[PDB]
Every structure is written in structure tokens, then in C-alpha cells.
Amino acid sequence: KHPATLRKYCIEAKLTNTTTASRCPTQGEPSLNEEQDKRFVCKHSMVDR
Amino acid sequence: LQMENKAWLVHRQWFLDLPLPWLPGADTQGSNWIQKETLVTFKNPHAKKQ
Amino acid sequence: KHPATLRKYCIEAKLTNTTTASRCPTQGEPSLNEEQDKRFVCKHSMVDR
Amino acid sequence: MRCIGISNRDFVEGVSGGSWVDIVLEHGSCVTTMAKNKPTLDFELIKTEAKHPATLRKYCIEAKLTNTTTASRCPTQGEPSLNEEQDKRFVCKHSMVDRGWGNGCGLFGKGGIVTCAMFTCKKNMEGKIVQPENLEYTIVITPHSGEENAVGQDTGKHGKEIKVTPQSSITEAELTGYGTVTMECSPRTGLDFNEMVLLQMENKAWLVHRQWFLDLPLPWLPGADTQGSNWIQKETLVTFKNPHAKKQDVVVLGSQEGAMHTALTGATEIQMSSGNLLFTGHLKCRLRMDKLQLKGMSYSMCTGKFKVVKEIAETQHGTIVIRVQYEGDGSPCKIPFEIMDLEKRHVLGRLITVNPIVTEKDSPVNIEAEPPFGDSYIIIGVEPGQLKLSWFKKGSSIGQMFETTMRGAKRMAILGDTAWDFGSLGGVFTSIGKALHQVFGAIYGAAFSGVSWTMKILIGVVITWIGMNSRSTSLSVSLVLVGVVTLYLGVMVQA
Amino acid sequence: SVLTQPPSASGTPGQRVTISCSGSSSNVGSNYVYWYQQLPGTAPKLLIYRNNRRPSGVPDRFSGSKSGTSASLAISGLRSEDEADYYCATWDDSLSGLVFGGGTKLTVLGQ
Amino acid sequence: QLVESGAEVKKPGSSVKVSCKASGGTFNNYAISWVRQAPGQGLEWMGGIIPIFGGANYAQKFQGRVTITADRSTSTVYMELSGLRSEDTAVYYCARRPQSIFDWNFDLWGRGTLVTVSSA
Amino acid sequence: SVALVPHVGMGLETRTETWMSSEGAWKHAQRIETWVLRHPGFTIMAAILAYTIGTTYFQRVLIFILLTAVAPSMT
Amino acid sequence: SVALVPHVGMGLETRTETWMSSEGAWKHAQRIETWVLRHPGFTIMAAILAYTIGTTYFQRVLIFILLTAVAPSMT
Ligand SMILES: *[C@@H]1O[C@H](CO)[C@@H](O)[C@H](O)[C@H]1NC(C)=O
Ligand SMILES: *[C@@H]1O[C@H](CO)[C@@H](O)[C@H](O)[C@H]1NC(C)=O
Ligand SMILES: *[C@@H]1O[C@H](CO)[C@@H](O)[C@H](O)[C@H]1NC(C)=O
């Protein structure tokens, strides 16, 4: 009786508002306003430019 | 553990070691999922686009 | 000529909008809505209750 | 400027007696071929299409149960039977329950019980297949002149897309001003599509091994079924539970989409929405340059003033590209381009844009050249108004040899025994090496099939240790070589 | 700085008229020059791309000229259709942006 | 193949976001630039972006005042202007160009969104 | 995957049957058997390596068994 | 489940990055490390058993890694 939630796992999700940003070679890293929000999933990588 | 009208009696450590996005349980907004990288894939096949 | 900013560093900061959240023992972690905004610096700890 | 700017660019230099060269074209790469008296060309594989795919299974990733039926026999009276137990659209299982006077049997034993539920599929993944004759590789050939590749909606007079199929594997591309280029490709020695499956999930598709696809532990339809209702391994998507020995139940195991995604790691992702497009894999082609001539070789030097409209930009292949306009007379003229030392006493570099010419006065042309590793000077034009451009290259010859050897080893890692055709001109050493590589690759693929990269690292370390602690010197050397190659392959694998 | 362009242009039907756009070493003569026709109450239309190459849309009567540090647009035959504001856009290496001209309103006589 | 956002009437000191929805081919193959034409004035280039790459570049006049972004999920490009003022009144266009750094031939245009900084 | 970290050795087992005890009792062994059948080449190499490394037949057999069980498991 | 046969050592790997390659590169090592951290009691037993069974130091270590890798992945 009287259970308390310890953790809530996610088993199914949806991704929206996909957006990309780039800073071309030697000039550092790209900036997205979405990286400030923690409900956006972000990743950094290099592309040929 | 309660997953869509089924329940299990699991070990607490095993439960907390699950590699899925999760919320603290104290969470109310329900949107600051953490460990989200376990449920999303990032692709840069030829290093031309992400 | 024509410099490009590679990075911007913070030397003098200020803290405002400090908030805190607590969870009773064995019940997991506290949840702060601010903790979803990367504009907020956060840290987790333990306090005897 | 497309092949420049691709990190996987490859430089193929030289032709044999016959003006042909063997090249392997990969999807993510580029091949730039240079001959003694031929225009430099860029080769890219930009499209692989599989047509008219045929399904062979329709594995179910999410099912449900709707008509649960149970049958029981009192103890000592043998197993029960249900009518649905002969229905192929039903999942059944036999168990035991405790029975007695309270239950309603009257014999106090363990009575057989069987429960059946109707299995219905809600989501499935189609494992289509294609005939190796239905593949179609699209290859773009561009003459790699300083001439701009043009803008869309108006003209496509620069890029030349040649489609190659197993039926018509020899095709000719007529490049305006450079003659024609003949490609003798072997699409039948590429992916071996007879052993491949085009696995299509909800909105995502993968190219997977066919035996791996046929060994998947999910319920499947033969692929010729239009009504379903005859799934094979229905037991893999359901669980029968008899808590204690009182009541027997059955439930489905939940959507297998995520588990399938986990199972697909190491399979390359393809496209199957608007046709079956595979942006993965290679194509071996033999390139015939006999009818390929430099454009405007019967021109006179410009004898005018060039201006650099875009400063020298270094690429990631060791070369440099410079964009020069022409303000002079006799517009269709050769550009006097050299890469010398400070005193202009030696020629230090080679321009890989052979025979740059100016078609129009104000039209800019961007030359690509490979300067030396030291300090060098780009000289553009003639005495009146000559442009002398300084440049410095950071690398070194030893480093370049190391990088070239590493790229060759990587090519062998991916195109095992097909790398020997990458820039082959026939040759006997190449043939002997290719045969030896075929034998060794057969042995290695037999001994390391289905093994992960961590297992490869472990086995390589074990074999290297065995070789180092060996009595025979020849056996020690052979084992050390095998172990080091295995370590390299385990470090370079799963990409 | 910006591509200086003639604010006022005048012509008569059946007459060939050209517009002059003069830039700097980094505006024009170092980058392609694009000419646009912008009628009132409508978005600009690309007249000539690259260095005076006609897109399929514009008729053959339209054409442009490019020089060492200036450009020009040529009109084969004239009409009231050529009464519009004209802009020469070219990438500026020093300005680091697509800089149009001042805009040329071409007036066609016949009223 | 390029459709812009509807008309917007704003107030001084505010911020306005303009939407330009391109097709799939134009999103993954071409760049999109933002040109604003003031009332009775010549064309002006604000900035652009390669939607597939997403790195935005702006005219030196608009540093810190214009934000251009793309929505790869909806295949849309947005321009956000901060510090709206009387002189910011103009029509705004989104044009489709190749993603090469030398060619700015706008072979496609939208229809312009009138950002009217006034009261009606 | 969550499927790679099952709830087996948690020491919570009672007389009541578990979630998929009947199913999952032999699934790992069946997978190893299927993998060995599909990859006879790696089994021979593992046997040779175990014979070479193992001083005694207990060491050799244990090494071979562990290698054969590991090869599918890592994959 | 289907996730336990992940299409890893099937050959036909091109120069284009495969599906979930980055994560799958180290997921298995991560899970073994987490298992060893959460279950140090079995790891010590494996070390003792490998030392006893192993004659030479190389055999001891090989048996140790084999045991500690099979233990979590065994199910
Ligand atoms: C995501 O996109 C939708 C439009 O489809 C928009 O309404 C919403 O505000 C966006 N969310 C964020 C966080 O940008
Ligand atoms: C921080 O506190 C101030 C105090 O009035 C408030 O105006 C502001 O909205 C707060 N910021 C956040 C992000 O909550
Ligand atoms: C399941 O039961 C329903 C009862 O409404 C029946 O109509 C249907 O035919 C049954 N399906 C079977 C027996 O497969």
C-alpha cells in the first residue's frame, strides 16, 4: 500500500523539431539555441566542407 | 515495476541500472528526460550530413 | 584582418534565481524544473532528513 | 569542386599499355584519375538501385491475442485437446494444473490443460530480396577542369551520369571536349545480392545478411501470403504462464521494434521508400582512356594578366585550389601555371588540373595543384603582370608514405582482395597478390565469421602471444603476422 | 562599398538599353554579377546569372555585359515591360555578404 | 516550390519571426537567403543558411539582430528579427540558391511577408 | 539494449514461476548452438587455440568452452 | 530476444557507417564493466578459479577474462 514513484523510464519516444548547425573548418563549434534546452537531444560530429 | 498493465517485482539496483531515458520520480514536468541517448540514434553515414 | 571568434570565455559571472529541491531517503532524486534549462548551473548532493 | 572537399578522395595515376586502369568506386569516396597525356577525371558512385524486389518473409514485430480458449482433462485421463489446436492462426501450449474435488475433477491429481489464443500481427518487417541482375549503379564522370560545374535549371553540360547494370556493364560516356570514356564495370562482383536481404521496417530499411535474416527468432510469413494467419514461430512472440499450478494464461511479448533495432547494429542502413536505393558498397570498373584527349591542347599561352579572385585554399588531400580570372586578349588560351622555388630554378609541384585554359575572359577558372612539402611558389601568367604566390605545405614525405600505407591497409580491410584492383594496370605481381589475398581472405572469413571486434582483438592478442612464445622461427613469424593483422582488422572493423 | 547603380534610366520601345553597375575590386571583377528585375508589388526576378548568362525564363532579347570592374544588362528591343526597378547583386569578399546595387528604376517612354 | 508565411503587423521594440517552407529537394540541395526590401527602397540582403548544414551567416549590418534557422523535421526556414523599429518596416523574401560559395543566382522566390511596423 | 541485462541472478526467486522461465531457461544455450552451427570455422580455430594454450585437457576443454560461449555473447 | 543476435560479424561491411555502430562499439564492454562493478563477489571467485585452473600466468589471465565476460552475457 501507499507506493511511491522511484523512477520513470521511457520505453517509446518521438523526435521532432530536428535542426542542424555547423561551423566550418578551424572556426570552432556550431551553436544551436536548442542545446540550451534539456528536452532536446544533441550530438556533435564533423562533416566534409 | 509497472509497464502497460503488467507489473514485475524487480531488484532495486537492477531497476536503477536500466539503460533507458528516465525521470527522477519526483519529476512533475515530465519533459527533462535524462539518458535520452539510449533511445535515439545519430547518423553521419559518409561524413556528409548528420 | 577579418578575425573569426573561436571561443568566448567567462571571467566574471553572477548567480541569480537560486532554487533547491529535496527528496526523502530511498525515494530517488529531487526534480527541479530549472534543471531542464542549461542556463542554470546545478548540482546534486545529500542532506540528512 | 565536388570531388575536392570529400575526405575519401583517391588519386589514381597511370595507365597500362592499352590506356585502361582498374578502379574500385565506393559510395562515400571519390576517384580522381591522372594519366600522362590525359585530362584529369573525377569518378563518383552516386546511386545504387535495386529494382523489382521480391519478399521472402514478413517477420512480425508486434502481435496480439483475442480468442483465449482452455481445455482440461481430469488427472489420469491423458492430455486434453482443443479444436483451435489444429488452427494455424492460434498459439497453444500444454501444461498441468492441480485438480481435485474442490476444483471439480474428482480424482486428486495433475490434470493436463491446454490454452489457445488467436495470434494476430499488428506490425511486421518485410525482408525483400532482389535479383543480382536488377541492380543499377549510377556513376558520374566529371572532366575536372577549372571550368565551373554550372548552376541548375539551365544546363548540365559538365557532369556525365552513366548507368551501369549487369546486362549492360560496358558503357561509354561522351565528355564534351575530352572525347569519350569507356567504363567496363563488373556489378556482378559487388555485394553478392543473392546473399542479401532488403529489410524494411516501419520507415527505415537495412541491407542485411540473408542467413541472419532467416535465423531471426520472430514469427514469420513465407512472403507469398496475402491473408497471413499462418505465422510460423508464434511461440517466440507470446509467453505462457502457469503461476503455481492453478490457472494457465498467455500474453504477447510487446512490440519488438526496439529489440530489432538493437539486432540491426552492424547492418548498413539503406532507403526503400521511393525505390530501393543503396548508398553503400563499391563497384569495380575498368576505365578506358583511349578516346580521351585533353581539351584545347592546340592553344597558345594567354600572355595576359590573371587576378586571383579567391585566395589559395588548401584541401585535405595535400593539394591546393586557386581561383583566377583572366583580363587579357585571346580568351581561349592556356594558363601559364607553374609551381617553382623562390628563384624559379626548379619545378617543385604538379598541377592536378592538367591543361587549365580560359574559355571566357571574365569567367573564373579554379586550378588544383599538388605543391611540395616545403616552401613553394605558384606562378600564374607571363612577365607582364605575372602572379607569384607563396605557399607552405605542412606535411612531410615520411608522413605522406605512412598515411598512404595506412590508406592502403584500410582499403584492404574494407575491399578485401578487391583493393588489388583499385589502381591496377594488369601486372603479374598484382595478380599473384590478389590470388594470395583471395586464399587468405577465404581462410580468415571462415575462421572469423560472426565474431565481434572485441573477440577479434582477444584472438589477435592470443595468436600474437602464441607466436612470440613459439619454438619455430618461421611459425613464430607467421603467427605474429596473423595476430597483428587480426588486431588491425579488429581495430578497424565495425564501421 | 556598395555597387553604385544609376537611379534613373529612360528608354523608348524598340530601342536597346543597358544598365551600368560599377563595383570595387571585391564587389565586381572578383565575383559573379547577377541582375534582377523587380516590378512594383512583386518579388525580384533573376534576369541574368553567373556573369551575364540568361536563365531559360528570360527571353533572348535580355542579355548582360561584364567588364573588369563593372557590369551591364542589355535589352534587345524595348517595351513598357522594362519599366521597373533594377538591381545588381554580387558577393563582396570584403563586405562578406551579398550586396545589391542602389537600384535602377528604368522608365520606358510612350505615355 | 517555396511558400512563405502570412502577413504580420507588429509594434516597435518587438521581435518578428518569418516562416519560409521549402520542399524536400530545395531543403537538402540548395541554400536559402533572406532579402528585405524597405518601402520605396532597394533590395537588401539579411542573411542565409544551408538548411542541411544549418550554419547561418548574416550581413554585417544585422549582427545580433537577425536569427535565421531551419526546421529539418518540417522542412522550414525561419528568420527572427529583434529590436523592431520604424526603419525595420519592409517586405521580406526567401530565395533558393545553390550552396556553393560563389553562385548567388536566386532561381526561386517566395512572395514576401509585409512586416508592417505600425498601427492599423 | 535493456534485453541484454535480464533479471536472472538477482536472488529474488520464489516458488512462483518467473516471467519467461520456461522460455528463457534454454534460450542462451540454443543461441550458442545455432551460432556454432552457422560458424564452424570459428569453432575449429577456438579448438586449436584451446589445445595450444591449454597445458592439460581440463584447461583446454575449459578454454574452448569459454571461447565458444563468449564469441556469440559479445556479438 | 531478437536483440541477442545483432548482425555484427556478418561481413559485408562497407566504408559507410553502419546502424548504431558508435554505441554498439562499446556497449558490450560497458555492460561487462557494470556487471563486474555490481557483482564483485563473483569476480573474486573467477580470479581464484582461474588461478587454480591456470598453470601459467597467461592461462590464468585468459581464463579470468573468459569467465568474467561469459558471466554477465551468459544471460
Ligand atoms: C517545434 O516545431 C513546432 C512546429 O511544428 C513549433 O510549433 C514548436 O514551437 C517547436 N518547438 C520548439 C521547442 O522549437
Ligand atoms: C529570476 O527571478 C526574477 C525575479 O523577479 C524573475 O523576474 C525572473 O523571471 C526569474 N528568472 C527565471 C528564469 O525564472
Ligand atoms: C473470436 O471470437 C469472436 C467472438 O465475437 C468470433 O466472432 C470470432 O470468429 C473468433 N475468432 C476466431 C475463433 O478465430
Tell me, what DSSP letter sits at residue H72? H
Indicate if the alpha-carbon torsion angle H27, H29, H33, H39 is positive or negative: positive
Contact list, G10 vs chain B (CB under 8 Å): 10-11, 14
**Which residues on neighbouring strands pair with residue D334, listed in sequence order?**
D301, D357
| Enclosing H/E stretch for D473 | helix D473-492
Sign of CA dihedral D355, D356, D360, D361: negative
Shortest-distance atom of ligand 1 to CA A17: 1
Q: Are G42 and G71 within 8 A, CB to CB?
A: yes
- CA dist., res. D443 & res. E85, Å (int): 75
d(CA D44, CA D28): 8
How many CA atoms lie less than 13 Å away from D304 in the CB half-sphere?
21
Question: Residue F71: what are its φ and ψ, rounded to 5°?
Answer: -110, 90
d(Cα F21, Cα F4) in Å, to the nearest integer?
Answer: 6
For chain G, what is the domain count? 1
Q: How far apart are CA B47 and CA C5, in angstroms?
A: 25
Answer whether G54's CB lies under 8 Å from G60's CB. yes
Between CA D468 and CA D476 the distance in angstroms is 6
CB-nearest partner of G10 from B11, B18, B20: B11
d(CA H49, CA H30): 24
Minimum CA–CA partner of D314 in chain A = A25
Residue F10 to residue D372: CA distance in whole angstroms: 60
Query: Cα(first)–Cα(last) distance of chain C, in Å?
Result: 60
CB H46 within 8 A of CB H39: no
Of D65, D66, D67, D120, the one to substitute when testing ligand 3's pocket (max ligand atoms within 8 A of C-beta) is D67
User: What is the distance between the alpha carbons of residues D190 and D421, in angstroms, rounded to a whole number?
Assistant: 13
Mutate to test the interface with F, among A15, A16, A20 (most CBs of F within 10 A): A20
Q: After which residues is chain B broken (C to N over 2.5 A)?
A: none
Helices (H), chain H: 21-38, 40-53, 57-73
On the 0-12 / 13-18 / 19+ scale of CB atoms within 10 A, D437 is middle
Beta bridge partners of F30: F98
* E strand segments, D362-418: 365-369, 375-380, 387-392
DSSP E strands in D342-408: the ranges are 357-358, 365-369, 375-380, 387-392
- Name the grid cell of D51: 529494382
Resolution to one decimal, Å: 2.8
Interface test with D, best of G2, G13, G14, G23 (most D CBs within 10 A): G23
CB contacts < 8 A (A, B): 63
Give the ligand whose atoms come closest to the C-alpha of residue A38.
1
Contacts of D200 (CB under 8 A, 6+ apart): D125, D126, D127, D128, D272
Q: Is C11 exposed, middle or buried (0-12, 13-18, 19+ CB in 10 A)?
A: exposed
D436: Cβ contacts below 8 Å, ≥ 6 apart: none
Q: What is the C-alpha to C-alpha distance for residues B47 and B40, in angstroms, rounded to an integer? A: 19
Q: Can you list the pairs that D276-279 forms with residues at least 24 positions away whose Cβ atoms lie under 8 Å?
A: D276/D49, D276/D50, D276/D51, D276/D53, D276/D128, D276/D130, D276/D198, D276/D205, D277/D47, D277/D48, D277/D49, D278/D27, D278/D48, D278/D49, D278/D50, D278/D191, D278/D207, D279/B45, D279/B46, D279/D27, D279/D28, D279/D47, D279/D48, D279/H16
Sequence-ordered list of residues with C-beta below 8 angstroms from that of G46, at least 6 positions apart, any chain: G64, G67, G68, G71
* Contact between chain H and chain C (3 or more Cβ pairs less than 8 Å apart): no
* Chain A residues whose beta carbon lies within 8 Å of the beta carbon of residue D255: 12
Which chain F residue lies closest to B47 (C-alpha atoms)? F53
Q: Who lines ligand 2 at CB under 6 A?
A: C 16-17
Sign of the Cα pseudo-torsion (D90, D95, D97, D100, in order): positive
* C33 part of contact set with chain A, CB < 8 Å: no
Which residues, 6+ apart, have CB-to-CB distance to D192 below 8 Å?
A: D132, H12
Q: Do D215 and G71 touch (CB under 8 A)?
A: no
Give the domain extent around G54.
Answer: 1-72
- Distance separating alpha carbons of residues D34 and F110, to the nearest angstrom: 45
Output the nine-digit C-alpha cell for F11: 509594434
In terms of Cα–Cα distance, which of D256, D329, D474 is closest to A12? D256
Burial of A19 (0-12, 13-18, 19+ CB in 10 A): middle
* Chain E neighbors of F106, CB-CB under 8 A: 34, 36, 44, 46
Question: Cα–Cα distance between D130 and D193 in angstroms, integer?
Answer: 7
Q: Provide the 8-state DSSP code for G8.
A: S
CA–CA distances in Å: residue D131 to residues D26, D165, D195, D275, E4: 21, 12, 10, 15, 63
Strand partners, D357: D334
Rounded Cα distance between D401 and E38, Å, is: 57
How far is D465 from D454, CA to CA, in rounded Å?
17
Residue A21 in contact with partner chain F when CB distance is under 8 A = yes
Q: Among D5, D255, D258, whose Cβ lies nearest the Cβ of A49?
A: D5
Backbone φ and ψ for D357, nearest 5 degrees, come out as -135, 160
- Tell me phi and psi for residue H30, to 5 degrees: -60, -45
User: In which element (H, E) is residue A39 found?
Assistant: none
Distances (CA, A) of D490 to D2, D184, D380, D460, D493: 32, 34, 48, 8, 5
Q: Do E48 and E32 touch, CB atoms closer than 8 A?
A: no
Cα(E73)–Cα(E76) distance, rounded to whole angstroms?
A: 10
CB C17 within 8 A of CB C34: yes
Cell, residue E51:
556573369
Query: Residue F116 corresponds to which amino acid?
Result: T
The approach used to solve this structure was cryo-EM
A17 close to ligand 1 (CB < 6 Angstrom): yes
Closest ligand relative to C39 C-alpha: 2
Closest atom of ligand 2 to C37 CA is 13
- Measure CA of the first residue to CA of the last residue in chain F; give whole Å: 32
Give the DSSP letter of residue D242: -
Give, for G11, the enclosing helix (H) or strand (E). Answer: none
CB contacts, 8 Å: B49 with chain F: 28, 52-53
Instruction: List beta partners, residue D110.
Output: D98
The CA-based dihedral angle spanning residues D249, D255, D259, D263, taken in that order and rounded to the nearest 10 degrees: 110
A18 CB near ligand 1 (under 6 Å): no
Contact by Cβ (8 Å): C4, A27:
yes
Cβ-defined contact of G67 to H66 (cutoff 8 Å): yes
Q: Are D58 and D223 within 8 A, CB to CB?
A: yes
How close G57 gets to chain D, by Cα (Å)?
A: 18
Cell numbers that stand for E23 in this block: 563595383
In angstroms, the CA E4 to CA D193 distance is 62
Nearest by Cα to A10 from B39, G18, D327:
B39
Say how far apart CA H49 and CA H27 lie, in whole Å. Answer: 27
Contact A20 F69 (CB under 8 A): no
DSSP-based three-state secondary structure for D353: coil
Whole-angstrom distance, CA of residue D385 vs CA of residue D305: 5
Query: Cell triple for residue D412?
Result: 584492404
